[PDB]
Amino acid sequence: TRDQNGTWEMESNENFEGYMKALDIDFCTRKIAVRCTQTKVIDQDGDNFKDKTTSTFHHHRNYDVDFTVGVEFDEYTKSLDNRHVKALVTWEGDVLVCVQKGEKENRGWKKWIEGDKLYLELTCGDQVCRQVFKKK
Amino acid sequence: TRDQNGTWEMESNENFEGYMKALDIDFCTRKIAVRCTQTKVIDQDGDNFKDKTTSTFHHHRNYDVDFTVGVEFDEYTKSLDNRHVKALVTWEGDVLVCVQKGEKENRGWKKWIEGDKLYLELTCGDQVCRQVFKKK
């Protein structure tokens, strides 16, 4: 049949990355594009076509870590760089301090309550990231 | 206080990209990561900690094309390779066939209905991508 009218949801995708490579699309765009869902709305009147395609990219990660202060533990940093470190968490006053021994030097974090907010400083080498969280 | 229990929502995030760079996280991952929401649930019993962090990012793009079978038209392939092509769509039986004339050779697609599914084959050079769509 020639009638392509309808709302179409992509259910299978084969060799999208090979096609994109042939178009000289960079590895980054290919990595996001191949993870997208695709919805195609086709409005067709005889030989006249309107095609609206919506591509959607959705990312969710969960990263769960359990530890006991003072007991060195094995950490696999799956939510970041996916490396194995030997982490040791200790208290320095009211600050929670973690050294993450492994491939990277000067790697760890500090976590503390100040005001009614949670402060997190992550360090690796010469870089320090500071994050602040509020209670929900 | 040493009591870090609670559900925490990130409200400030500074030098995350520098920290990720030091961890050898590529720019492609970093651009997604800096856009994620972050919620941290800390369950703490004395020196025993469970930390569950969840990160989410959602993005959607639209690509809308109108054409008439047999009428050549100008197409700019944003959301793929960002090139200008002169597209010409024709019927070959009940198969909708398009040639995207331009820089890339053997570039085009075929679109047809078989059963109640929509089949799309995209071609560039020696690469063929095959996509199958179902009705919603």
UniProtKB/Swiss-Prot annotation, chains A, B:
Residues the entry annotates as binding all-trans-retinol: K40, K111
Domain of life: Eukaryota
CDD domains attached to this UniProt entry: CRBP2 (cd19463)
One BP annotation, GO: vitamin A metabolic process
MF terms in GO: fatty acid binding; molecular carrier activity; retinal binding; retinoid binding; retinol binding
Keyword Cytoplasm: yes
Keyword Lipid biosynthesis: no
InterPro entries hit by this protein: Calycin, Fatty_acid-bd, ILBP, Lipocln_cytosolic_FA-bd_dom
GO cellular component, one term: nucleus
Subcellular location: Cytoplasm
PROSITE patterns, per database record: FABP (PS00214)
SUPFAM superfamilies in UniProt: Lipocalins
Distribution of this protein across tissues and organs: Higher expression in adult small intestine and to a much lesser extent in fetal kidney.
Keywords: Cytoplasm, Retinol-binding, Transport, Vitamin A
Family membership: Belongs to the calycin superfamily. Fatty-acid binding protein (FABP) family.
Function summary: Intracellular transport of retinol.
Domain notes: Forms a beta-barrel structure that accommodates hydrophobic ligands in its interior.
Protein name: Retinol-binding protein 2
